[PDB]
A paper describes a structure:
Here we present a series of TIGR03971 SDR crystal structures from several mycobacterial species which contain an insertion in the primary sequence at the NAD cofactor binding site. These crystal structures demonstrate that the inserted protein residues almost completely cover the NAD cofactor, only leaving part of the nicotinamide ring exposed to solvent. NMR experiments did not show exchange of the NAD cofactor, whereas binding was demonstrated for a number of small molecules which could be potential substrates, products, inhibitors, or artificial redox partners. Experimental results are consistent with the notion that the SDR family enzymes linked by comparative genomics studies to mycofactocin do indeed keep their NAD tightly bound beneath a protein structure that may interact with a specialized adaptor machinery for redox exchange.
With the exception of the M. thermoresistibile target which did not contain NAD, all other mycobacterial SDR target crystal structures contained NAD, which appears to have co-purified with the protein after expression in E. coli. For each of these crystal structures, the adenosine mononucleotide portion of the cofactor binding site is enveloped by the inserted residues and only a portion of the nicotinamide ring appears open to solvent (see representative examples in Fig. 2A and B). In addition to the insertion loop which covers the adenosine portion of the cofactor, a second loop which typically contains two α-helices covers much of nicotinamide mononucleotide portion of the cofactor. In contrast, this loop is ordered in each of the mycobacterial SDR crystal structures presented here. The combination of the insertion loop which covers the adenosine portion of the cofactor and the ordering of the second loop which covers the nicotinamide mononucleotide portion of the cofactor results in a significant decrease in the solvent accessible surface area of the cofactor in the mycobacterial SDRs, relative to other NAD- and NADP-dependent dehydrogenases. Only a small portion of the nicotinamide ring appears available to solvent in each of these cases, indicating that the NAD cofactor is tightly bound and potentially non-exchangeable. The structures presented here have a cofactor solvent accessible surface area of approximately 18 Å2, whereas other NAD- or NADP-bound dehydrogenases have a cofactor solvent accessible surface area of 82–89 Å2. Given the encapsulation of the NAD cofactor by the two loops in mycobacterial SDRs, a large conformational change would be required to release the NADH cofactor after a redox reaction had occurred. To test whether or not the bound NAD was exchangeable, we performed a number of line broadening and STD-NMR ligand-observe studies, and did not observe exchange of NAD/NADH during the timescale of the NMR experiments.
Author numbering:
A (entry chain B), B (entry chain A): 16 to 289
């Protein structure tokens, strides 16, 4: 496959897009180092990924013939992230690819404290992404075989839709900010042959959307968010996780070898929809 | 392959990226309908593609086991383009994919007439692209199986570099304009399931660059164009045609199935280089 000899570090691998990334990278020959918080968060109004789901991701990876090192870990805990990464380097010899995918949706009409939700969103989706890159770069430079960093942004966030609650604003500002991290790190790391890109998905069928009524009530409550989620293509009112994985696969494989500094819109035309 | 049962109409197929598109689409199962001007143009200061080169593209396609209908035709000649397209529909049953690739570089310190070069550039790279979409859309709608339109933009053009000669300005304005055609047509045609995207390559090793001294003398003559061509990635001071073909293949295949309205930067980081 396209990822033979590759080793991918993936945050948020318990389910959804992260699990899709793990399974589909392994199909192309990659070994996987995955983490997930494996705990709910009080102010996030839907169930997060479980340890049991993370195990299942590993089993799905192992059905491909590849291997997965999986650990419970929070991207806010930088030292823990580094320890799991280092254990990855030990088990597999190296890590050459990083997918910073972990995130949460904080949209909630019953948000209790705006400043708190803002801080939490930023911690997970901005600082957490930065942590995920930080634990990897020294190693990628050291081993001198270049590499790939990938961050998961969001199309909906790049369309300037907020209800002005703290959680929503954290999501928008984090997801935009990380496109800057992508572009700036692409330039910074070019000379080390570390390519850096992102993906900006439109609505993707995962629990964050499919089991999160709070979200539907917030767009139902605001006139300016009435068409917040609509896409262009009739067959894709939402996309599937594999669509996102396929974009990443393109970017990190020989097919997309010259790409760095790009954020691909996996959006079913959401960006042009007017 | 990824393009089994597909039929691709390609302008500028004699050589370079167009030939790469034809050969690499055919490798994935596609039959090809290709055209090229097959003539030099007086005010373009390098040799254009020949009839012999177009024949060779067809031979390369046929070595894959697929078929190519090839004709000498100018994208400025809309009725001729339509005729060749219709003959394609005839020979192969349908055309579901269009790649508007034909173009020329009009950079030339010895430009004789600015207004003339401006007009010619626009005719070929703006109106010519519009013609290429126009000949295909009625059929794609009629046949009702959706489809793909692809236009070739340019990274260097999207970086706002001109010497203010007519030819250079035609190139910059046409290549930018066609990103608008891409986004607007993506929206327009979404309901017909016709997906519309573009590619913006950085410097690509073809005669337009490799056998065009005029170009090097124009950047050598202007202080503000000293670093006009530099990319970020050390291994890609230029890219190869297959890099562009791989990006198109992603977009038009099931892998890139939700993409519409996008312009992919096949740029080795040129867009972030500063
Ligand atoms: N689903 C969508 O519509 C959509 C659209 C655009 C972007 N996104 C983004 O895609 C990414 C993946 O989301 P998904 O759709 O797969 O949803 P998901 O909630 O099904 O998966 C995300 C996973 O990340 C984990 N996670 C959350 N916080 C964490 C933390 N602090 N540390 C470690 N792991 C953590 C969760 O437990 C869960 O397993 C997220 O960054 C999300 O913001 C999602
Ligand atoms: N080479 C680069 O660095 C570069 C960078 C960015 C974008 N582009 C674009 O990529 C496209 C392909 O160029 P290439 O690099 O393969 O160069 P090329 O010169 O090798 O190929 C272009 C082909 O288009 C044909 N052509 C020109 N005018 C035509 C017309 N009016 N009708 C029909 N055919 C015509 C030529 O005969 C030639 O065979 C062009 O649109 C160009 O503007 C090129």
């Amino acid at each position: 496959g396209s990822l033979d000899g590759r080793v991918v570090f993936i945050t948020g691998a318990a389910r959804g897009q992260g699990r899709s990334h793990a399974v589909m990278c392994a199909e192309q020959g990659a070994n996987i180092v995955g983490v997930d918080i494996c705990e709910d968060i009080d102010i996030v109004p839907y169930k997060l990924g479980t340890y049991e789901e993370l195990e299942e991701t590993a089993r799905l990876v192992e059905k491909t013939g590849q291997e997965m090192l999986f650990r419970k870990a929070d991207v806010r805990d930088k030292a823990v992230l580094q320890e799991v990464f280092d254990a990855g380097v030990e088990q597999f010899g190296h890590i050459d690819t990083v997918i910073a995918n972990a995130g949460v949706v904080l949209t909630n009409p019953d948000e209790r404290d705006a400043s708190e939700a803002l801080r939490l969103g930023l911690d997970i989706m901005l600082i957490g992404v930065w942590n995920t890159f930080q634990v990897a770069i020294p190693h990628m430079k050291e081993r001198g075989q270049g590499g790939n960093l990938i961050a998961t942004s969001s199309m909906i966030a790049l369309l300037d839709l907020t209800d002005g609650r703290g959680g929503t604003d954290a999501y928008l500002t984090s997801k935009l900010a990380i496109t800057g991290l992508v572009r700036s790190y692409a330039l910074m790391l070019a000379a080390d042959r570390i390519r850096v890109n992102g993906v900006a998905p439109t609505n993707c069928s995962t629990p964050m959307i499919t089991e999160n009524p709070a979200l539907f009530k917030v767009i139902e409550e605001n006139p300016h968010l009435v068409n917040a989620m609509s896409t262009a293509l009739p067959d894709f009112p939402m996309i599937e996780p594999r669509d996102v994985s396929n974009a990443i696969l393109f970017l990190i494989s020989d097919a997309g070898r010259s790409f760095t500094g790009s954020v691909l819109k996996v959006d079913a035309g959401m960006d042009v929809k007017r």
